[PDB]
Amino acid sequence: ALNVAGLFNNCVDCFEYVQLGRPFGRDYERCQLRLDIAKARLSRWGEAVKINDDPRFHSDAPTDKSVQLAKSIVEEILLLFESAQKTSKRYELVADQQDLVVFEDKDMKPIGRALHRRLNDLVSRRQKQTSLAKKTAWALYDGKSLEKIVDQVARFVDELEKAFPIEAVCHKLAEIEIEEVEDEASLTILKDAAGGIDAAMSDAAAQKIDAIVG
Amino acid sequence: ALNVAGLFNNCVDCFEYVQLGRPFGRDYERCQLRLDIAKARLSRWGEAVKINDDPRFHSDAPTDKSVQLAKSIVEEILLLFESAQKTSKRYELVADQQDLVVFEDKDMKPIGRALHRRLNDLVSRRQKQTSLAKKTAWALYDGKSLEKIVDQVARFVDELEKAFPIEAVCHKLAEIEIEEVEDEASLTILKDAAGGIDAAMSDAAAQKIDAIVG
């Protein structure tokens, strides 16, 4: 349909429309942070690879092998959202109306809300397109469905990185995402929440905590 | 797009086009049998629920809650095939050409091939439609991707059954699928391969083995 850069941008956009429903309870804050980090890791990739400037990502059928993988992988992230959406639209068909109230970042503690917003801004600043498809908000209703998205986005981005020589560039980009967050409490939160989904963000946060501690 | 019965029939049809590539090695026969059983379990459901005769499944937006779930679930099985397809099209982009040779049921032992064909015939005999969409053959290349399909089709059909009162009817239908397979060797194979994916077929096979043994 659209070129690879267009698919990618719509991928990143999809996180914009996911809400977390009542059953998350006290896990809301942390789970949002994990979605934000997975979102961050995907957009980082696109920056490392200069998705909006490298013309290779600007055709509908690319010749190059690597661009074809990334086109495949990106189509597959979209399908993840599509499955999740459908699982959710059907919990709603059966649910007690109470559990249909979604959380917002007002419902986090101050420290977690600053981090959600800061992680979102980083990604906004990389999002070029106005021309994103239209989407509607939908909700996740259990820890398992969120883990599937989070874990599978992380494996997908692992393989996007494999396809290109940028793991050095990604490390640097990860340090830059963090150079303005100074307090250990906040760096601690990010080291922990990146865990098992963004080694790069985690090592950076780890590096920074030790740097203050001497 | 199409009504629920049309979606369902295309679901069942999708198994028709999945091939198992070289890396399955000696696990080929068993893994095919597991796909066949998951295929069988899905078509069983459609029969139990009279998918081609109950008019409720013959509209594009149904009102009924249950028909809406099944419409949702069926769309989600299709997405499974769609994801798998894409994962496979990208192993092929990277693969050694040797691993691109697929197995056929000539490559089973006699006993397993009779069971593959017999499980296929049962389902053919329930497939009404000529008017199925067009599809092309594609290959699975690892044990994990097949397990995802097999296990997730089984959970999906669990929930299709939940949505309707037919678990009695499904048990009966499972016994009927088996009333002509007489030899214990064959019933043993089916009891084991149904394991963790078709309790109904398994209990039936178990029941039948004990019946000969006295």
JSON list of C-alpha atoms in Angstrom, two decimals, chain A residues 65 68-69 72-73 75-76 79 82-83 86-87 90 93-94 148 152 156 159, chain B residues 65 68-69 72-73 75-76 79 82-83 86-87 90 93-94 148 152 156 159:
[
{"chain": "A", "resi": 65, "resn": "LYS", "atom": "CA", "xyz": [16.88, -7.38, 1.21]},
{"chain": "A", "resi": 68, "resn": "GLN", "atom": "CA", "xyz": [12.22, -5.89, 2.66]},
{"chain": "A", "resi": 69, "resn": "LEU", "atom": "CA", "xyz": [12.71, -7.46, 6.12]},
{"chain": "A", "resi": 72, "resn": "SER", "atom": "CA", "xyz": [7.83, -7.36, 6.61]},
{"chain": "A", "resi": 73, "resn": "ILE", "atom": "CA", "xyz": [8.55, -6.72, 10.37]},
{"chain": "A", "resi": 75, "resn": "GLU", "atom": "CA", "xyz": [3.63, -5.05, 8.68]},
{"chain": "A", "resi": 76, "resn": "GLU", "atom": "CA", "xyz": [3.80, -7.59, 11.49]},
{"chain": "A", "resi": 79, "resn": "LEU", "atom": "CA", "xyz": [-0.96, -7.07, 12.83]},
{"chain": "A", "resi": 82, "resn": "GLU", "atom": "CA", "xyz": [-4.83, -5.46, 14.94]},
{"chain": "A", "resi": 83, "resn": "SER", "atom": "CA", "xyz": [-5.08, -8.72, 16.93]},
{"chain": "A", "resi": 86, "resn": "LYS", "atom": "CA", "xyz": [-9.94, -7.48, 18.35]},
{"chain": "A", "resi": 87, "resn": "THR", "atom": "CA", "xyz": [-9.24, -9.34, 21.57]},
{"chain": "A", "resi": 90, "resn": "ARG", "atom": "CA", "xyz": [-14.47, -8.77, 22.60]},
{"chain": "A", "resi": 93, "resn": "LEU", "atom": "CA", "xyz": [-18.73, -7.44, 24.60]},
{"chain": "A", "resi": 94, "resn": "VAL", "atom": "CA", "xyz": [-18.71, -9.48, 27.83]},
{"chain": "A", "resi": 148, "resn": "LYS", "atom": "CA", "xyz": [2.61, -9.90, 24.35]},
{"chain": "A", "resi": 152, "resn": "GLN", "atom": "CA", "xyz": [6.97, -8.95, 20.72]},
{"chain": "A", "resi": 156, "resn": "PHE", "atom": "CA", "xyz": [10.84, -7.32, 16.39]},
{"chain": "A", "resi": 159, "resn": "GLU", "atom": "CA", "xyz": [15.55, -8.09, 14.42]},
{"chain": "B", "resi": 65, "resn": "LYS", "atom": "CA", "xyz": [-23.48, -11.21, 20.99]},
{"chain": "B", "resi": 68, "resn": "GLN", "atom": "CA", "xyz": [-20.13, -11.26, 17.14]},
{"chain": "B", "resi": 69, "resn": "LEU", "atom": "CA", "xyz": [-17.54, -13.06, 19.31]},
{"chain": "B", "resi": 72, "resn": "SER", "atom": "CA", "xyz": [-14.14, -11.54, 16.12]},
{"chain": "B", "resi": 73, "resn": "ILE", "atom": "CA", "xyz": [-12.37, -14.91, 16.90]},
{"chain": "B", "resi": 75, "resn": "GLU", "atom": "CA", "xyz": [-11.00, -12.70, 12.11]},
{"chain": "B", "resi": 76, "resn": "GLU", "atom": "CA", "xyz": [-8.25, -13.36, 14.64]},
{"chain": "B", "resi": 79, "resn": "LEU", "atom": "CA", "xyz": [-4.53, -12.74, 11.39]},
{"chain": "B", "resi": 82, "resn": "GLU", "atom": "CA", "xyz": [-1.30, -13.64, 8.11]},
{"chain": "B", "resi": 83, "resn": "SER", "atom": "CA", "xyz": [1.45, -13.13, 10.71]},
{"chain": "B", "resi": 86, "resn": "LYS", "atom": "CA", "xyz": [5.01, -12.94, 6.90]},
{"chain": "B", "resi": 87, "resn": "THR", "atom": "CA", "xyz": [7.42, -14.49, 9.38]},
{"chain": "B", "resi": 90, "resn": "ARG", "atom": "CA", "xyz": [11.22, -13.49, 5.72]},
{"chain": "B", "resi": 93, "resn": "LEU", "atom": "CA", "xyz": [14.74, -14.00, 2.36]},
{"chain": "B", "resi": 94, "resn": "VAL", "atom": "CA", "xyz": [17.66, -15.19, 4.51]},
{"chain": "B", "resi": 148, "resn": "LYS", "atom": "CA", "xyz": [1.91, -20.86, 18.17]},
{"chain": "B", "resi": 152, "resn": "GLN", "atom": "CA", "xyz": [-3.66, -20.50, 19.62]},
{"chain": "B", "resi": 156, "resn": "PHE", "atom": "CA", "xyz": [-9.63, -19.82, 20.09]},
{"chain": "B", "resi": 159, "resn": "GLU", "atom": "CA", "xyz": [-13.63, -19.83, 23.36]}
]
